[PDB]
Nucleic acid binder design. Structure first.
Ligand SMILES: [Mg+2]
Ligand SMILES: [Mg+2]
Ligand SMILES: [Mg+2]
Ligand SMILES: [Mg+2]
Ligand SMILES: [Mg+2]
Ligand SMILES: [Mg+2]
Ligand SMILES: [Mg+2]
Ligand SMILES: [Mg+2]
Ligand SMILES: [Mg+2]
Ligand SMILES: [Mg+2]
Ligand SMILES: [Mg+2]
Ligand SMILES: [Mg+2]
Ligand SMILES: [Mg+2]
Ligand SMILES: [Mg+2]
Ligand SMILES: [Mg+2]
Ligand SMILES: [Mg+2]
Ligand SMILES: [Mg+2]
Ligand SMILES: [Mg+2]
Ligand SMILES: [Mg+2]
Ligand SMILES: [Mg+2]
Ligand SMILES: [Mg+2]
Ligand SMILES: [Mg+2]
Ligand SMILES: [Mg+2]
Ligand SMILES: [Mg+2]
Ligand SMILES: [Mg+2]
Ligand SMILES: [Mg+2]
Ligand SMILES: [Mg+2]
Ligand SMILES: [Mg+2]
Ligand SMILES: [Mg+2]
Ligand SMILES: [Mg+2]
Ligand SMILES: [Mg+2]
Ligand SMILES: [Mg+2]
Ligand SMILES: [Mg+2]
Ligand SMILES: [Mg+2]
Ligand SMILES: [Mg+2]
Ligand SMILES: [Mg+2]
Ligand SMILES: [Mg+2]
Ligand SMILES: [Mg+2]
Ligand SMILES: [Mg+2]
Ligand SMILES: [Mg+2]
Ligand SMILES: [Mg+2]
Ligand SMILES: [Mg+2]
Ligand SMILES: [Mg+2]
Ligand SMILES: [Mg+2]
Ligand SMILES: [Mg+2]
Ligand SMILES: [Mg+2]
Ligand SMILES: [Mg+2]
Ligand SMILES: [Mg+2]
Ligand SMILES: [Mg+2]
Ligand SMILES: [Mg+2]
Ligand SMILES: [Mg+2]
Ligand SMILES: [Mg+2]
Ligand SMILES: [Mg+2]
Ligand SMILES: [Mg+2]
Ligand SMILES: [Mg+2]
Ligand SMILES: [Mg+2]
Ligand SMILES: [Mg+2]
Ligand SMILES: [Mg+2]
Ligand SMILES: [Mg+2]
Ligand SMILES: [Mg+2]
Ligand SMILES: [Mg+2]
Ligand SMILES: [Mg+2]
Ligand SMILES: [Mg+2]
Ligand SMILES: [Mg+2]
Ligand SMILES: [Mg+2]
Ligand SMILES: [Mg+2]
Ligand SMILES: [Mg+2]
Ligand SMILES: [Mg+2]
Ligand SMILES: [Mg+2]
Ligand SMILES: [Mg+2]
Ligand SMILES: [Mg+2]
Ligand SMILES: [Mg+2]
Ligand SMILES: [Mg+2]
Ligand SMILES: [Mg+2]
Ligand SMILES: [Mg+2]
Ligand SMILES: [Mg+2]
Ligand SMILES: [Mg+2]
Ligand SMILES: [Mg+2]
Ligand SMILES: [Mg+2]
Ligand SMILES: [Mg+2]
Ligand SMILES: [Mg+2]
Ligand SMILES: [Mg+2]
Ligand SMILES: [Mg+2]
Ligand SMILES: [Mg+2]
Ligand SMILES: [Mg+2]
Ligand SMILES: [Mg+2]
Ligand SMILES: [Mg+2]
Ligand SMILES: [Mg+2]
Ligand SMILES: [Mg+2]
Ligand SMILES: [Mg+2]
Ligand SMILES: [Mg+2]
Ligand SMILES: [Mg+2]
Ligand SMILES: [Mg+2]
Ligand SMILES: [Mg+2]
Ligand SMILES: [Mg+2]
Ligand SMILES: [Mg+2]
Ligand SMILES: [Mg+2]
Ligand SMILES: [Mg+2]
Ligand SMILES: [Mg+2]
Ligand SMILES: [Mg+2]
Ligand SMILES: [Mg+2]
Ligand SMILES: [Mg+2]
Ligand SMILES: [Mg+2]
Ligand SMILES: [Mg+2]
Ligand SMILES: [Mg+2]
Ligand SMILES: [Mg+2]
Ligand SMILES: [Mg+2]
Ligand SMILES: [Mg+2]
Ligand SMILES: [Mg+2]
Ligand SMILES: [Mg+2]
Ligand SMILES: [Mg+2]
Ligand SMILES: [Mg+2]
Ligand SMILES: [Mg+2]
Ligand SMILES: [Mg+2]
Ligand SMILES: [Mg+2]
Ligand SMILES: [Mg+2]
Ligand SMILES: [Mg+2]
Ligand SMILES: [Mg+2]
Ligand SMILES: [Mg+2]
Ligand SMILES: [Mg+2]
Ligand SMILES: [Mg+2]
Ligand SMILES: [Mg+2]
Ligand SMILES: [Mg+2]
Ligand SMILES: [Mg+2]
Ligand SMILES: [Mg+2]
Ligand SMILES: [Mg+2]
Ligand SMILES: [Mg+2]
Ligand SMILES: [Mg+2]
Ligand SMILES: [Mg+2]
Ligand SMILES: [Mg+2]
Ligand SMILES: [Mg+2]
Ligand SMILES: [Mg+2]
Ligand SMILES: [Mg+2]
Ligand SMILES: [Mg+2]
Length: 249
RNA sequence: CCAUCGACCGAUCCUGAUGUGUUCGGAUGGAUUUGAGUAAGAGCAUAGCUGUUGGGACCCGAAAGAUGGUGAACUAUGCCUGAAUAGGGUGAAGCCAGAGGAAACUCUGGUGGAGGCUCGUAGCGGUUCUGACGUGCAAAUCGAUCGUCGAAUUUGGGUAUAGGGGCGAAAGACUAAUCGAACCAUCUAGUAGCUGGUUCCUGCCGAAGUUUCCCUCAGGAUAGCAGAAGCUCGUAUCAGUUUUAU
RNA sequence: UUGCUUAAUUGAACGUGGACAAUUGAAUGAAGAGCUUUUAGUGGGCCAUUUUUGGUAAGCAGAACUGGCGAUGCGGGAUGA
RNA sequence: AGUGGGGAAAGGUUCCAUGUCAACAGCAGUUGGACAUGGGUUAGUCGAUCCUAAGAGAUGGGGAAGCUCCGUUUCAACGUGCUUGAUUUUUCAGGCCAACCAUCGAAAGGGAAUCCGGUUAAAAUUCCGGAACUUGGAUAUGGAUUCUUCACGGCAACGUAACUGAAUGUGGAGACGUCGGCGUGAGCCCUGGGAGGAGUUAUCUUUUCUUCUUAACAGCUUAUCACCCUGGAAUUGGUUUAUCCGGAGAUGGGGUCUUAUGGCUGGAAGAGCGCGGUAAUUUUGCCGCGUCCGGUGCGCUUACGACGGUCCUUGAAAAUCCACAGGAAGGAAUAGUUUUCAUGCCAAGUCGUACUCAUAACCGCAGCAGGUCUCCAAGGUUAACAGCCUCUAGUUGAUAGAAUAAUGUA
RNA sequence: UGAUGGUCAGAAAGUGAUGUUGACACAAUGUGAUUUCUGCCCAGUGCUCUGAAUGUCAAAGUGAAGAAAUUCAACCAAGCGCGGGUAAACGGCGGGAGUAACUAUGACUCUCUUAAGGUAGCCAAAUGCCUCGUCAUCUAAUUAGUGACGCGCAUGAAUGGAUUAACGAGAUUCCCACUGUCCCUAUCUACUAUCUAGCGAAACCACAGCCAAGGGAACGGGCUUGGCAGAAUCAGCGGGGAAAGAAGACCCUGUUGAGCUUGACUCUAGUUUGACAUUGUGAAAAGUUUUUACUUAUUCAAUGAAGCGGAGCUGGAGGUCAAACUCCACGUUCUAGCAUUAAGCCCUCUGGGCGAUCCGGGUUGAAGACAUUGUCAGGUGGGGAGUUUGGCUGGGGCGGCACAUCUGUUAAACGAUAACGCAGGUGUCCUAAGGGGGACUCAUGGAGAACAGAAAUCUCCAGUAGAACAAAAGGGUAAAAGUCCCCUUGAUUUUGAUUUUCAGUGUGAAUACAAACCAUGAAAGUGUGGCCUAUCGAUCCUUUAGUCCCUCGGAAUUUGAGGCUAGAGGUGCCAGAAAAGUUACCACAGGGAUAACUGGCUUGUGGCAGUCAAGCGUUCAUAGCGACAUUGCUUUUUGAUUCUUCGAUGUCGGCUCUUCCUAUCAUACCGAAGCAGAAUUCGGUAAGCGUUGGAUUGUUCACCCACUAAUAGGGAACGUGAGCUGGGUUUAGACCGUCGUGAGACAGGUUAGUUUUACCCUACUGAUGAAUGUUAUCGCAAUAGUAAUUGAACUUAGUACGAGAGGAACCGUUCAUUCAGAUAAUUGGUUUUUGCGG
RNA sequence: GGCAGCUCUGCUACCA
């Protein structure tokens, strides 16, 4: 047969992300002396739309502690953050929406976003619109914090990892139907080349494991082993179960 | 030279003398066994015809396979930067005014100018005539008719993706008139039990389509049938026939 | 002659020596008999008489013997392997 | 929405003049994109050149037997650094920084600066005449400023001929989708008077057609929006085609600003245009007159403006230029400073530039009914940039003659 | 899938895409707006989940034996197995009988059985074979359409079920309007064609070009026999040249491919699991293993390597029970401002210290001897690679085995002899069912004997085998070859010869001896498996036995290995490859050795016609029929065959047009009747002449409606595609149902799908034309062609005939149908009269 | 043909 559409994406010729209009990478500040020992104050200059992103971004200006210079940061805007607001980041920052605090400095039940998986990676968890991270508890002896991720998973993170207080702005986006193929076209025009999708069952046997037949049908189980190889992993990969989800999981 | 019975040498089997590193030796006598042997050498070398095998292999002929390269001037898709798209119809929100109601609210007239809306040009496409043409104007065009015509629109240029690879709103489609695996050169005079051809004269002889074996059944080998060279001899004793006896 | 065989001096096989001469033991014929090497093409067949199997039959399919066509012209069957 | 006038790609001399007809132009040929000989493309301002885009790609490194692959500042000791006071001791003294930063990548993106009239057989935003502009450099005079050293005025918005300002920093411009109606301008269309020229005139027609124009650049003036001062608003008012605004200060009164756009003047009538009268084999003219004053709009095209709608779509970058913050350093009185005020001086290299752009200059074997990106766009009819007729411009090219059976094609 | 990640890329990499990303995300799939719903099944195949105990279980490692190679054993990862989950995973979703005060049905019951047995819905639907289902409606008539019905070959629920407004160059039916689509054609215009001047190709071409019949490769231009036959030609035309275009694309063959699939054969990138290495330093506990401590190897990340680690200054605290130890902090939080090139103090040294605490120069985190990487080892791996996927055959395929074989027959009295001929058999079975010896006689019948009878056991007689001998059939056998008894292993050893098949090769099987050693019998003798004819297997490799022999090549010993001779392990496609599919996307070499048309032979079958005459026909065989039988014809059916064509003869039907046949439907003339008339039936000469308009269907066929004198049947390459058309079939797109794991299949349904060339020769239709002294006019007529057809009305006549009911015909008259040949008065149509008007 | 459990199921192995 032929190389299937799954495998052509790794080469990344026409499958790279369309990034001309993007407004910068959304990251926290580099963890420095001020954030480790006290707090540093910045001011929100802009709240802007980032193409390909549901969450708006905030442009926050900080002073450089060591040279006469202004540093502009690109944060993910939490809902309620406004232009001209003062943003405080550090160990001694107060528990206000938009402030960046270490996870150990936040009491249980604190809603936090753009949380660091590892100390200083500048934000990994809960970055999309309407999403957040809940702080479950602390383990001060081991310097660890328990959090709940938007997927429902419980994670143990260093208490020195940082997060931004509040919920990511732009939530409720999925509640409205797109209603049109053109709307999805414009949605993916600034994301990547993944739309529209032809069904593999509608192809020929060269194109896909599902192609061929005198009727459109998969022919074999569409649940594929985790240990299958590239060109085989088309369908439900390592599916623990199938069918309509009934009851609680 | 022919037929036949013997003899000798080697192997195999049997017997087993004087003797002895007591386990070796193997005299002697045998055997419906066996060798491409001995039995007063015939070979070696050169050349010629014919036949054989490997080689391009009598000549021309695949569909394929491999190695290394060249193409995105067509086209497919993404990206970057530009450009293009008469005139109408319909009349969404929002807004103004009036009327009715206890309230919750309702009705009417305007205004407004929404929509992968609609009629319809340019444009883009290509339904039907199964029209023309069909050694064409044209290796896809011409005419009428038709789809769509403000967006998933059309399009220039730049740029990216390269052959078991790309790209595909998916037809095995498109990837320079080439695609169910492009093009170029080479391996390569690839192999072919298959098709075609195979060049002067006369003289003499002259077939087979049958046996057996074969993944054998359009092919081979084998035996037969045929030619050539002769050799040993010269009526020796043979015959697709009869008779007699059985 | 033998180591085979017989109760044997019997036999078996192969012999020495002697006799039977062209009517040397039927016909007819005999461009002579015997022997060897090597190699070609072929290995689709078909037809006629007679015998014969399957089939309703077939210019059908399958065997037997012979003769033909193939490979072959010539006279006849008008024409025709 | 051309058979008009230009261009991009592509071609490459096809351009122009002269000669010329063997071949080619599927008839012809005296003609030609054919053949032969010559001629022809003029730039500081138009492009390239420079910038960065998607991307391409050296170096330091790391793979790979290797051809080479990855990577693009990457695990790198990465400046052929600058700015000054200089020194004439051709030595220096230092003062700042070195995040990022090889390079290539657009004749449609960004971007310093030019227009009009004339001129050739063929070139022209390139030549000639005149009139400007930008950048780089040099540099003097005038003006400006200083004894209160680095100017004044205005309540203010802000004004001006000028009117210090290093390192470093902050901003702005470059720099940005699309649609809808509205408003203003420009060009075109329409039209009145007057001064000319042409046409019709049996009859009619104070008639029909036509000329009456004004570049870049310089000065003054000119605007929606926005802003300032005054004042204090319900009986709410102002206000758009579109309902938004006002105690976070409306209406009213008075001002400030951007100069898009228009007006006046200079450029500039001397030019061009339209007439009339004369010169002459005649290179080429010479003379006179006029070139003026209006109006109109759901008009067309286009530019701009203030608005409004739209998106799970929010619609490049960089070079480059400026301003501001900062206060380093240097500054006067018998004299000091500055080329962001005026005037004056010098220079601007290299390459492209002819012509076609298509029913004959490109690609389809060809002078092929195919294909190939874009700009300008008159009158009538009309909803209309449709169809139909016409003006300017351009073509009249496609073998032809004679007949008019059948069968065709339309 | 929470980043030490998922998905994907790369030969590798200090390498990449998603990713300027972070579950409202990225990646992978299925279904396909809305509405209403998405039932039951986890047995199968997948996927997934745990492993406390656990079958299998690689390399390394461990233990034992051995002189060692080596062997054996224990242990033993993942995987598999075991257990669970999962269908909006792949998928699946049953049969048989009885039953209700008529019948029908079966609410109900019984019975087999599954993982579950098709739920809600829907339907002769694009899915139903039968089938043109049945009913209704639509029409004059409907294989079409629509509405119902439903034991539905084979409907059915995100392999989505049922609906559905709007939309559609999608498929279909009906109605109005409209019309040359048609009845049924006519006329007009331009451009061709045509003729001329100029210019000027190509396809194609063995030679060529008139027919009929024959034979012939079974459809001739040539050959044979006939008809005939007279220069040179022009415009048309499409009968023929099995016309041209292309080494058939269907079919088969080839030890030719390729695309695709899978549980084919053989591998493989990747991935996973173990071991060793990288790999070091400690502690503890289990018997080397487990755990956790260190950091410097290694790995991850960030930064313009900016503030790390420890200690000390300052406050806030503990209640201080010595003496200040322990803990915390140690300059910034109403506001969209500002923060940059140190002030100040101290020592003098255009400079140093403090401001700005000291010390360690570890940039800072994470991770850590685990990852990672290298090398082996096991698993997984149609993602990919390579290859394979018998033969015969009345085409192939399916079936069968006629593939190694045995008996009888075919088989034609030696031997041999074929077919997918006929009736059958073999892949075994037997320590006796082998060998020897001895004794006996079998099947069956009759006559007798308690229970006892047709069949128990006993007795006699008869008994040529009518029994038995392992198994097919044939042969053979009587003091035996059969039955019973006794003893045995000759079913042994060595190696030759011979017979059959035959090449006089192998294999199988068998025969007669030689040399041994035995069994049995008194002995002669017999015995080298089965009474005879079938009952079976090479090279290479392995294994065993024998000889204990030969060799391991520098010389030895002992292991091990290799030789020699004989068996065994097996090839059944049986003289003996190691082997799954699909192609409707297809390719190549060929084949008329071979299928799908026509043609040819045949004529079973189809159709048609005779002979006989038992019966039918009130009686009566034969007016008209005619059983049981029997003889033919035809080639308008379908078979059978495979002769022609596979370097191609265009394969359905219709339209159009001509001709022919007769087995005559009508029309002319007649004979017969169970012929009164009328009608009808049977028959003769007869093909002169006609044989229709429509609904449904692609249809041939069919079936209705209707008219008619009648609505006969056929042929001409199943006439006729360079005549058309293209509805069907039968390329490639797509849907459904059933089948298949799948790619895919269906001779099932459905929808969309390029129809090319004549200008040559001939033939046909027309048109000229040399020369028969020239020219003109008028003629003759050989030969060829030929043409008319049918009905109605009136009259005869309400007559003949007839009980009546009914009810003709000839002569004649007027019209009409179909056809033919003209013509343009009239009427209509046509208009470039561009004539006139608008 | 090896293991192992309940006459036998499961796993593993395959040069005539
Ligand atoms: Mg989707
Ligand atoms: Mg899809
Ligand atoms: Mg498809
Ligand atoms: Mg596949
Ligand atoms: Mg699969
Ligand atoms: Mg499939
Ligand atoms: Mg489907
Ligand atoms: Mg000799
Ligand atoms: Mg070749
Ligand atoms: Mg090749
Ligand atoms: Mg190969
Ligand atoms: Mg291109
Ligand atoms: Mg419009
Ligand atoms: Mg067209
Ligand atoms: Mg056509
Ligand atoms: Mg034509
Ligand atoms: Mg149109
Ligand atoms: Mg492009
Ligand atoms: Mg297909
Ligand atoms: Mg192509
Ligand atoms: Mg050759
Ligand atoms: Mg062959
Ligand atoms: Mg001879
Ligand atoms: Mg074989
Ligand atoms: Mg042949
Ligand atoms: Mg030979
Ligand atoms: Mg031979
Ligand atoms: Mg043959
Ligand atoms: Mg021959
Ligand atoms: Mg002869
Ligand atoms: Mg003769
Ligand atoms: Mg004859
Ligand atoms: Mg010229
Ligand atoms: Mg010419
Ligand atoms: Mg000429
Ligand atoms: Mg020239
Ligand atoms: Mg310029
Ligand atoms: Mg330059
Ligand atoms: Mg870049
Ligand atoms: Mg390097
Ligand atoms: Mg550049
Ligand atoms: Mg440029
Ligand atoms: Mg731009
Ligand atoms: Mg530009
Ligand atoms: Mg000029
Ligand atoms: Mg010019
Ligand atoms: Mg000049
Ligand atoms: Mg002043
Ligand atoms: Mg200018
Ligand atoms: Mg002026
Ligand atoms: Mg425009
Ligand atoms: Mg100046
Ligand atoms: Mg020019
Ligand atoms: Mg053209
Ligand atoms: Mg070319
Ligand atoms: Mg225009
Ligand atoms: Mg027009
Ligand atoms: Mg022409
Ligand atoms: Mg003409
Ligand atoms: Mg699904
Ligand atoms: Mg639906
Ligand atoms: Mg299940
Ligand atoms: Mg299961
Ligand atoms: Mg092991
Ligand atoms: Mg295990
Ligand atoms: Mg049901
Ligand atoms: Mg049904
Ligand atoms: Mg149907
Ligand atoms: Mg109908
Ligand atoms: Mg019906
Ligand atoms: Mg129905
Ligand atoms: Mg079903
Ligand atoms: Mg379901
Ligand atoms: Mg279904
Ligand atoms: Mg509907
Ligand atoms: Mg429709
Ligand atoms: Mg559409
Ligand atoms: Mg003609
Ligand atoms: Mg014949
Ligand atoms: Mg003939
Ligand atoms: Mg012929
Ligand atoms: Mg003749
Ligand atoms: Mg013809
Ligand atoms: Mg013709
Ligand atoms: Mg062929
Ligand atoms: Mg073969
Ligand atoms: Mg193959
Ligand atoms: Mg292929
Ligand atoms: Mg650091
Ligand atoms: Mg390790
Ligand atoms: Mg695989
Ligand atoms: Mg494969
Ligand atoms: Mg076969
Ligand atoms: Mg079979
Ligand atoms: Mg046979
Ligand atoms: Mg065989
Ligand atoms: Mg015989
Ligand atoms: Mg056997
Ligand atoms: Mg016995
Ligand atoms: Mg016996
Ligand atoms: Mg006996
Ligand atoms: Mg023999
Ligand atoms: Mg045998
Ligand atoms: Mg014996
Ligand atoms: Mg030796
Ligand atoms: Mg040695
Ligand atoms: Mg054996
Ligand atoms: Mg074997
Ligand atoms: Mg065989
Ligand atoms: Mg054989
Ligand atoms: Mg098929
Ligand atoms: Mg044949
Ligand atoms: Mg017949
Ligand atoms: Mg018959
Ligand atoms: Mg009777
Ligand atoms: Mg045939
Ligand atoms: Mg053929
Ligand atoms: Mg033909
Ligand atoms: Mg042909
Ligand atoms: Mg007759
Ligand atoms: Mg008759
Ligand atoms: Mg006739
Ligand atoms: Mg019909
Ligand atoms: Mg026929
Ligand atoms: Mg026919
Ligand atoms: Mg024809
Ligand atoms: Mg045709
Ligand atoms: Mg069709
Ligand atoms: Mg099809
Ligand atoms: Mg299935
Ligand atoms: Mg179509
Ligand atoms: Mg009467
Ligand atoms: Mg007529
Ligand atoms: Mg007129």
């Amino acid at each position: 047969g032929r190389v299937i559409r799954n495998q052509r994406k790794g080469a990344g010729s026409i499958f790279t992300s369309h990034t001309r209009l993007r407004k910068g990478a959304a990251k926290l500040r580099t963890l420095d002396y001020a954030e480790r020992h006290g707090y540093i104050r910045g001011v929100v200059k802009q709240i802007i739309h980032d193409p390909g992103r549901g969450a708006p971004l905030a442009k926050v200006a900080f002073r450089d502690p060591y040279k006469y210079k202004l540093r502009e940061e690109t944060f993910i805007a939490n809902e309620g953050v406004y232009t001209g607001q003062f943003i405080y980041a550090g160990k001694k920052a107060s528990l206000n929406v938009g402030n960046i605090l270490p996870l150990g400095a936040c009491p249980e039940g604190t809603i936090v976003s753009n949380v660091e998986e590892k100390v200083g990676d500048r934000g990994a968890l809960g970055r999309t619109s309407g999403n957040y991270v809940i702080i479950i508890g602390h383990n001060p002896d081991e310097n660890k914090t328990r959090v709940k991720l938007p997927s429902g998973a419980k994670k143990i993170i260093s208490s020195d990892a940082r997060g931004v207080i509040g919920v990511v702005a732009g939530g409720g986006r999925i509640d409205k139907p797109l209603l049109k193929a053109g709307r999805a076209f414009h949605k993916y025009k600034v994301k990547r080349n993944s739309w529209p999708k032809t069904r593999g069952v509608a192809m020929n046997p060269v194109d896909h494991p599902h192609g061929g037949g005198n009727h459109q049908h998969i022919g074999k189980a569409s649940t594929i082993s985790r240990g299958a190889v590239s060109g085989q992993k088309a369908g439900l990969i390592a599916a623990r179960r199938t069918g309509l989800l009934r009851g609680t999981q």
